[PDB]
Ligand binder design. Structure first.
Ligand SMILES: [Mg+2]
Ligand SMILES: [Mg+2]
Ligand SMILES: [Mg+2]
Ligand SMILES: [Mg+2]
Ligand SMILES: [Mg+2]
Ligand SMILES: [Mg+2]
Ligand SMILES: [Mg+2]
Ligand SMILES: [Mg+2]
Ligand SMILES: [Mg+2]
Ligand SMILES: [Mg+2]
Ligand SMILES: [Mg+2]
Ligand SMILES: [Mg+2]
Ligand SMILES: [Mg+2]
Ligand SMILES: [Mg+2]
Ligand SMILES: [Mg+2]
Ligand SMILES: [Mg+2]
Ligand SMILES: [Mg+2]
Ligand SMILES: [Mg+2]
Ligand SMILES: [Mg+2]
Ligand SMILES: [Mg+2]
Ligand SMILES: [Mg+2]
Lengths: 120, 145, 93
RNA sequence: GGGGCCUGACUGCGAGGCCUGCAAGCCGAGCAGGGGCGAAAGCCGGGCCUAGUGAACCGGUGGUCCCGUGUGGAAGGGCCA
RNA sequence: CUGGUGUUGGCUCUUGGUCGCGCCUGCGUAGGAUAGGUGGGAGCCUGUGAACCCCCGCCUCCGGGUGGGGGGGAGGCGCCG
RNA sequence: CGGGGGGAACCUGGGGAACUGAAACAUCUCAGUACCCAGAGGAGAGGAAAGAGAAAUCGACUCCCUGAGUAGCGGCGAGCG
RNA sequence: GCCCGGAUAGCUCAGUCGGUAGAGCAGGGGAUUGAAAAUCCCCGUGUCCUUGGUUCGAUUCCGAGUCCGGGCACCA
């Protein structure tokens, strides 16, 4: 159709409009990675910074990079997630005005994305 | 600017129902012609009552019925009718029924509230509901002699 | 005039004309070129409403209009007739 | 007039005078700090000198041992530039 | 004179702004081809019914992209290069 | 049952100047004064804290003495307080 | 003092919707009328003020500095 069902089934345990924690979703991410291989859970968050800002991530203000497999224990995802948050909060440009980290999603290699508050 | 209706108006209706109109609509059209009343907390409680008096008090003419079925229901009538086998020499109206039912036992029934159409007359055997809404099918036997 | 319920009536006010960037920012300060006396009327209107065998009109302030109705209601429970539309009014508190 | 280094077109003061109704204007040796040129003696607190200027008030900025309306902090002031 | 409001209400037609979301969008040399950036990236995709053909709306760099639909039948497709 | 009209000042409320001062003048001052109107009474007003303001404080209101020409307000002027 | 807009041929004016910088008119020639052109043809010349950094560098995109263009105010 638009997507394959292998994905259509994961849309059953991910409220379309709800913020999850790094413990409420870190374990719900290890269950939405239904592939025949060990995937890589990654996190995507939009940064409130200026793109073309030479002295201040692609060229639109998006962050990527993977951090964990699709099996890693609850203490390897819930713990390695915060290890990426502070990896950013340690490089926030001087004039980076605006919520430095507005949106934040946590999606794997083939599974959907779960909006989560990197502060709980 | 809340208001309590009357005639079920489109987009907002079913009397008693409360709705948020614009002051103008209410003051200049609704109340003038009497399509509703101001949602004053003086009729907002006055409707609280209008709503209980029927709701609770209703448990009787549609709730006490249970007392009216337990006594009957598992009961059996059987009434003396002048007949001739499979054909009575007259008939028994619902009115004919309770007529003696209020002497054979002491049970009160409203004929106009029974359920058979034509006046018995025939025979074989009878058994039919009383009324109304959550009803109770009674059991009556057409006798002999 | 005056409000037949709120009691509100016209009052005196000054029309102060000022010029100059405030001190609240910019500089030097505001300046009064001139002051004048002027009135401030009540936004009163009129509200006609049946109430028994008459219509009776109410010249009342804007932010009070509603009370007028909460009065044709409290009225209900009381007997008022005879050629007394002025009195009807009279009676309603 | 020409050239080599330089920034004293210093900060904190200022004995003692000139001028003078007031308040302004003017000259200033010398001490302290930290400097520049000189081998040193020394000179340097702009310009051979006398014009190129504007009290207060109200505000604008940059600082800052200060005040900050019950207390903390702010708001808003003061002081210095 | 005038904008916003109060007095000031029904019913429609028509458009602007904004955030939600759902969708496609993108066509310069090279190249299967109409490639938006960056990451994940060997598994996906089809009786949760794909390969092929006709119909059919929209877009047009007239090249395709792509959706509704009927049809159909066990195969599409990516890496490597 | 009452009211209405009057009363030298005094009193509360609703309205409310200009001269003058600022050695001109508009903010400011005179001044909520003069005056007009309504009302009250031998007084009138006010009155038992949604107060004051820095004190483990006080405790209706009104009047006098201080506080005090203080705190402040002010074309930071005249002046007000 | 703040918010805005910008020179590129002699003047005037557009810009991968980042790489391919091009018009009117002026000027040269030829075409040119009785007369000068209105008609007719074909081209010259460069960071697109320009500091940059993103990108493959940039004319175009961001730090953005200089000048000019229009705006809204203030003046103790
Ligand atoms: Mg983008
Ligand atoms: Mg009036
Ligand atoms: Mg005004
Ligand atoms: Mg209102
Ligand atoms: Mg002197
Ligand atoms: Mg010397
Ligand atoms: Mg000296
Ligand atoms: Mg000189
Ligand atoms: Mg010299
Ligand atoms: Mg002055
Ligand atoms: Mg304090
Ligand atoms: Mg009497
Ligand atoms: Mg009397
Ligand atoms: Mg005067
Ligand atoms: Mg004078
Ligand atoms: Mg008075
Ligand atoms: Mg006193
Ligand atoms: Mg004082
Ligand atoms: Mg005064
Ligand atoms: Mg330009
Ligand atoms: Mg011509």
């Amino acid at each position: 159709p638009k997507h394959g069902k292998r994905y259509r089934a994961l849309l059953e345990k991910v409220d379309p409009n709800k913020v999850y924690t790094i413990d409420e979703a870190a374990r719900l991410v290890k269950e939405l990675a239904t592939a025949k291989f060990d995937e890589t859970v990654e996190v995507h968050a939009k940064l409130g910074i200026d793109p073309r800002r030479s002295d201040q991530n692609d060229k639109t203000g998006a962050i990527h990079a993977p951090v964990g497999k699709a099996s890693f224990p609850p203490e390897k995802l819930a713990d390695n997630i915060r290890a990426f948050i502070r990896a950013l909060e340690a490089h926030k440009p001087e004039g980076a005005k605006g919520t430095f980290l507005r949106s934040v999603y946590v999606t794997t290699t083939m599974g959907p994305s779960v909006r989560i508050n990197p502060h709980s | 600017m809340k208001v309590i209706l009357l005639e079920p108006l489109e987009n907002l209706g079913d009397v008693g129902q409360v709705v948020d109109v614009k002051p103008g609509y209410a003051r200049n059209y609704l109340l003038p012609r009497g399509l509703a009343v101001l949602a004053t907390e003086s009729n907002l409680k006055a409707l609280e009552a209008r709503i209980r008096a029927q709701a609770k008090r209703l448990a009787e003419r549609k709730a006490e019925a249970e007392r009216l079925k337990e006594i009957l229901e598992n009961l059996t009538l059987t009434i003396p009718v002048r007949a001739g086998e499979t054909k009575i020499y007259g008939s028994v109206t619902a009115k004919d029924i309770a007529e003696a039912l209020s002497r054979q036992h002491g049970v009160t029934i409203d004929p106009k509230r029974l359920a058979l159409e034509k006046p018995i007359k025939e025979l074989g055997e009878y058994v039919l509901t009383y009324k109304p809404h959550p009803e109770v099918p009674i059991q009556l036997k057409v006798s002999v002699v | 005039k005056v409000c037949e319920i709120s009691g509100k009536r016209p009052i005196v006010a000054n029309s102060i004309q000022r010029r100059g960037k405030a001190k609240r920012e910019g500089g030097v300060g505001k300046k009064t070129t001139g002051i004048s006396k002027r009135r401030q009327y009540p936004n009163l209107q009129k509200v006609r409403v049946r109430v028994a065998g008459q219509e009776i009109t109410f010249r009342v302030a804007a932010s009070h209009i509603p009370k007028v109705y909460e009065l044709v209601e409290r009225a209900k429970g009381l007997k008022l007739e005879g050629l007394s539309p002025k009195e009807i009014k009279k009676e309603l508190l």
